[PDB]
Amino acid sequence: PKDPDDERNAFLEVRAGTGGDEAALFAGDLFRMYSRYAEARRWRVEIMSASEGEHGGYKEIIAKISGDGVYGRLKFESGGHRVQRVPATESQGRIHTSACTVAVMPELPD
Amino acid sequence: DRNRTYNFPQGRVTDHRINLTLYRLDEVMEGKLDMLIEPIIQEHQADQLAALSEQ
Amino acid sequence: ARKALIEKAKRTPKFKVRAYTRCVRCGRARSVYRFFGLCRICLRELAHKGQLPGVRKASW
Amino acid sequence: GNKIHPIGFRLGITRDWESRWYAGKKQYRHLLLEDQRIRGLLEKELYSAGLARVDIERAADNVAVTVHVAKPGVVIGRGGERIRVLREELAKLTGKNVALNVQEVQNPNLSAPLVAQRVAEQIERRFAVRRAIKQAVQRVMESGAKGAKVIVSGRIGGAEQARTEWAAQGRVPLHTLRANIDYGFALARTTYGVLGVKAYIFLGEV
RNA sequence: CGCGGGGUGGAGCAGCCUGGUAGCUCGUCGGGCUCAUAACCCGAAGGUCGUCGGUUCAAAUCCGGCCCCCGCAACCA
RNA sequence: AAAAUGUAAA
RNA sequence: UGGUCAGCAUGGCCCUUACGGCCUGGGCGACACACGUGCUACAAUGCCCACUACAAAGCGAUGCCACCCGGCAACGGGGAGCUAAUCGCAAAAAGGUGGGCCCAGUUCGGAUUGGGGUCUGCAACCCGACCCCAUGAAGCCGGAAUCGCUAGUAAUCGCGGAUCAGC
RNA sequence: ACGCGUUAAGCGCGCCGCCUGGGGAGUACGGCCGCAAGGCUGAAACUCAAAGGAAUUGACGGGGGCCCGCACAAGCGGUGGAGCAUGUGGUUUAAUUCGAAGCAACGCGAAGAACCUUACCAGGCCUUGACAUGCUAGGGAACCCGGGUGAAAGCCUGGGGUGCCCCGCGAGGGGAGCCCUAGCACAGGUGCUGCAUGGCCGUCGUCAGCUCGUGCCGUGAGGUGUUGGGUUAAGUCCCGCAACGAGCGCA
């Protein structure tokens, strides 16, 4: 049972997947999903950078995270997050699917 | 490779790694994500602790 | 919780305030006339059918 | 949906109330609450005989309660029996005199809630659905009327996209007030959901 | 190190000469129009001015040390 | 003369 | 693929000392913000004051409560008349008439607040509504933009029921 | 099909040219021509389940004609600006219950949130329960009543009783409700799903339209009627009319 980061500190990136506008729209959706884990709890989270979204949210994002527990309560999701919604960017009223990428960046010696 | 799958026009979650199709979408998309965060860190008993118990 | 609260209005629990007017068919705490003991919609549908005596389409 | 209710359209115009009585203030409530409850067993029990229409009235306390049906041989029981254990069960929560004078319904093809109940459980029990709308409006048209109409909403045959479908023929002017129209409605519980059936027999001007 | 020019709201530029004197464009946040986004229309937000001494009453401005951007040199006969 | 654009599921 | 499974109904899925059931505090009323609907004003075609006139509707024996008197008062105790074209809520307000202001953040404006009171309802910290003192705030007519209405209609006045112990 | 139609796209014979799914691509390699720019000849790998022609019905048009609505114009007051009330986003929180989303969500469901309403939070209690069917099983009766106990819920625990049924003289048959329990399926859920549905309503919209029958026209989808001239608030009539009637509509 050997490891340092069982419960460490981390950065967190989010990028545009498919869905295009509902790529940046859903990436901003999960932004507030993580942003509300912050100061509804304790955490101090700056955005390090974030390229904008034309119809809302951001395509590229990245957030420097504070408070211990970003690697005991956030570690287990460096992958994809497909979503199936009726996007607020529809011509008619049909259902679509989207997806996004996430990246839990730990803490190199600095 | 998709870690989790959501669905507001159905209200659901599904983490393709446990079996965790167990869902609530609404007050999880709100950000209260300690619902799915727990059984997945509980899925480390059959993982690493089961690796160090006999083999 | 919506069934327990059905009878709770009827039997006056503890005071002359906690006896809110329910509807008799649907059971809604909103729009409940005390004339019919009926919600606006139970009132609606039973009005058109003829089942409410003497009531007809208003117009002036 | 948006369309008008045809019966409410003719209360004191072409069709009289299903229940009728004058009533004092705080008495009206539980006086109607009885009316409705009174039909509780009436809607329940008599359906098996094709419950055409209830017709409640209340004099000085006394409540006469005439009930129409397609074939009353059901309503009577073994002589004076089911028709008696009607009044027995009646006044046992009524408390008012339950003097019922059971009516009759000449032609069940010209009563709409009769055509409704039948078509409805024709799909409950599962049948050809459109045919039973066409046959219905058929032997009801020639069966006494000048015009007739009936509809089915919800899952016809049980498709996921719930269609509506209907049949109709002859001058059926819901806009025109002078028209006698029977609004026949019938719910229809099925394995896959709940079907809506509205009926429209037009019996003539007046 | 030698000389030359530069460093000011987020980006790019004025402002220094003649001190007290902070503007132009973009963008940014708030609002409008619009089905919506840009456009466009209405408002506001934003720099102790490289860095330090110091001159004066007082420094974006004058002066000097150091950090940095850039330009020519450091001739090797 | 004015005046752009609408990603991807029946 | 408008709205509603949260009015009710309803096919399917899930909970089963618990997603079901009871109480009690608390909550839907939180406050750097933003928006929609409205209210009341910025006044002199006005605000204040007493006399004073004139509508319909609509509601009331779970109540509507005259009139006496207490009271600055809200209201309070007393008490009459009604199954109500009987009597009650009821002074309709804009209005007419006398007076008073005197171009000012004012006698316009009534926000906000401190202590002091009545009424409901077990109950008034969150949390009500009315009352008295006092406090007397933004607002001197509205950026870009934007709404209704063609006649008893716009505009502007009071009254009224339903929800309801109260609001 | 459009349209062709003695100027054939008709009926025939003769001769040449050319086509053989779309892209790739009139490109590449070769060959010939050119001063060049380039022309002629002219493939394939790969790739798609189409590419297409005419015609129909719609929708759209910064096309046309004729109409209409407070649509603008013409006038009258108005929020946006202030302070307050109310509803949402948002944020916050222990929870800040849910739904409503341009027109058609935002004084909306709410025609009454202090607890109640109450579906949320928070902590003390319910386990066939606040709730209606019904099964055995221990069986008290009704229970006014009472303390204990607590914020209340609750859980403890007394003092109690002379019912009805049996006629058994009978100090005791069970039956009876209900009280009660533990205890047989049960309940119950405002938990998700309007993108599984009924019903109900908003909405284009009081807009003047939309269809059916038979006939004829077109191989057909379809057309006609329902178009046109006139009139109307209007598919309201009128005259005409390969149409004649009819239903749902305005009436």
Ligand SMILES: CN(CC[C@H](N)CC(=O)N[C@H]1C=C[C@H](n2ccc(N)nc2=O)O[C@@H]1C(=O)O)C(=N)N
């Ligand atoms: C390049 N030249 C050469 C000129 C002379 N006659 C020859 C020559 O080589 N002179 C060189 C002699 C050395 C001189 N030199 C260099 C370095 C130094 N520190 N000092 C010097 O004097 O620089 C001269 C130079 O190159 O011009 C011409 N174009 N004329």
Ligand SMILES: [Mg+2]
């Ligand atoms: Mg490390």
Ligand SMILES: [Mg+2]
């Ligand atoms: Mg929330």
Ligand SMILES: [Mg+2]
């Ligand atoms: Mg939490």
Ligand SMILES: [Mg+2]
């Ligand atoms: Mg009577």
Ligand SMILES: [Mg+2]
């Ligand atoms: Mg009796």
Ligand SMILES: [Mg+2]
């Ligand atoms: Mg017969």
Ligand SMILES: [Mg+2]
């Ligand atoms: Mg049945």
Ligand SMILES: [Mg+2]
């Ligand atoms: Mg027919």
Ligand SMILES: [Mg+2]
């Ligand atoms: Mg049924």
Ligand SMILES: [Mg+2]
């Ligand atoms: Mg320099």
Ligand SMILES: [Mg+2]
């Ligand atoms: Mg700079």
Ligand SMILES: [Mg+2]
């Ligand atoms: Mg310049």
Ligand SMILES: [Mg+2]
């Ligand atoms: Mg200098």
Ligand SMILES: [Mg+2]
């Ligand atoms: Mg200066």
Ligand SMILES: [Mg+2]
């Ligand atoms: Mg201008």
